[PDB]
DNA sequence: CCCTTCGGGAGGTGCATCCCGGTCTCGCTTGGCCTCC
């Protein structure tokens, strides 16, 4: 019940409702998220996958393998008979407010075009490519706790071991298929809250400040500068209250960089 | 058991290339289609 999946489920994929059948009583656990059967209430949806491997998934887990073309449109024209699936989706993201146990989809135009009439009446999409899921992140006023999802994915039960709910804008988690292990979140935690006020404190920097401060910090997080020569680029050019505020973290450094110029 | 020399003088110049030709990959899952059992 109280687990990433499920919200998600609820708030997204319930869409695809009528498109599962009924569930088969189980009685191991679901191998997607990995979770007990004592919280699926002993029931599950048995299935095999492209390589002849018996898995069981839960409610909100199996969700990512239907196939619901009149809902979801056709995602490959060769195969008309299979829809896109929300474990299959690569560059597309979403956000779920969990609380509000609302949606809203970020997908790519080509999706979009893919999807048919009837899914935005479920599911309100916006336009939007891999890279401009920042865009919308940093531009639109998020909703805590909340389930960012940045990359569906193929990689479905990474991509359900890699959910976690964003309690506040301070630490955004990305599930972007990757298995969030305890070594790569750094890589898949999103600061909006540090992002903004630098956004909101770069204005004061002229743009070519704002460029030589951006090389100067990607150099050095990639060690192609030596500290020296960052700080008297940072002294010479005045950039001293935005390393000021930048993490020690050259990783999210990186992040919070790629996000600033993406927006 | 002598007594071992002087110094002259020390380059001038050439000529210093052309051209190639810088790769595939793949880190996922699924179904359609092919033959196999
Ligand atoms: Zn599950």
Same mark, same amino acid.
């Given at each position: 019940?109280?687990?990433?999946?499920?919200?998600?489920?609820?708030?997204?994929?319930?869409?695809?409702?009528?498109?599962?059948?009924?569930?088969?009583?189980?009685?191991?656990?679901?191998?997607?998220?990995?979770?007990?059967?004592?919280?699926?209430?002993?029931?599950?949806?048995?299935?095999?996958?492209?390589?002849?491997?018996?898995?069981?998934?839960?409610?909100?887990?199996?969700?990512?393998?239907?196939?619901?073309?009149?809902?979801?449109?056709?995602?490959?024209?060769?195969?008309?008979?299979?829809?896109?699936?929300?474990?299959?989706?690569?560059?597309?993201?979403?956000?779920?407010?969990?609380?509000?146990?609302?949606?809203?989809?970020?997908?790519?135009?080509?999706?979009?075009?893919?999807?048919?009439?009837?899914?935005?009446?479920?599911?309100?999409?916006?336009? +939007?490519? !891999?890279?401009?899921?920042? @865009?919308?992140?940093? %531009?639109?006023?998020? /909703?805590?706790? #909340? &389930?960012?999802?940045?990359?569906?994915?193929?990689?479905?039960?990474?991509?359900?071991?890699?959910?976690?709910?964003?309690?506040?804008?301070?630490?955004?988690?990305?599930?972007?298929?990757?298995?969030?292990?305890?070594?790569?979140?750094?890589?898949?935690?999103?600061?909006?809250?540090?992002?903004?006020?630098?956004?909101?404190?770069?204005?004061?920097?002229?743009?070519?400040?704002?460029?030589?401060?951006?090389?100067?910090?990607?150099?050095? +997080?990639? !060690?192609?500068?030596?500290? @020296?020569?960052?700080? %008297?680029?940072?002294? /010479?050019?005045? #950039? &001293?209250?935005?390393?000021?505020?930048?993490?020690?973290?050259?990783?999210?450094?990186?992040?919070?960089?790629?996000?600033?110029?993406?927006?």
């Amino acid at each position: 019940m109280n687990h990433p999946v499920e919200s998600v489920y609820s708030a997204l994929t319930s869409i695809l409702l009528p498109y599962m059948g009924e569930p088969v009583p189980v009685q191991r656990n679901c191998s997607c998220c990995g979770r007990a059967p004592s919280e699926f209430d002993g029931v599950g949806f048995e299935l095999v996958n492209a390589y002849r491997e018996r898995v069981v998934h839960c409610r909100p887990c199996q969700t990512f393998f239907v196939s619901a073309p009149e809902l979801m449109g056709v995602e490959n024209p060769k195969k008309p008979t299979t829809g896109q699936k929300f474990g299959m989706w690569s560059g597309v993201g979403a956000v779920i407010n969990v609380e509000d146990n609302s949606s809203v989809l970020l997908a790519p135009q080509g999706v979009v075009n893919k999807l048919p009439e009837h899914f935005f009446d479920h599911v309100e999409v916006i336009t +939007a490519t !891999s890279g401009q899921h920042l @865009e919308y992140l940093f %531009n639109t006023e998020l /909703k805590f706790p #909340l &389930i960012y999802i940045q990359n569906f994915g193929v990689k479905t039960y990474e991509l359900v071991r890699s959910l976690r709910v964003s309690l506040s804008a301070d630490a955004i988690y990305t599930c972007a298929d990757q298995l969030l292990t305890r070594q790569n979140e750094v890589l898949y935690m999103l600061d909006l809250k540090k992002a903004k006020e630098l956004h909101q404190e770069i204005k004061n920097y002229s743009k070519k400040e704002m460029d030589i401060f951006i090389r100067t910090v990607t150099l050095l +997080a990639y !060690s192609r500068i030596t500290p @020296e020569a960052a700080s %008297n680029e940072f002294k /010479k050019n005045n #950039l &001293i209250p935005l390393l000021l505020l930048l993490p020690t973290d050259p990783h999210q450094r990186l992040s919070i960089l790629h996000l600033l110029k993406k927006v």
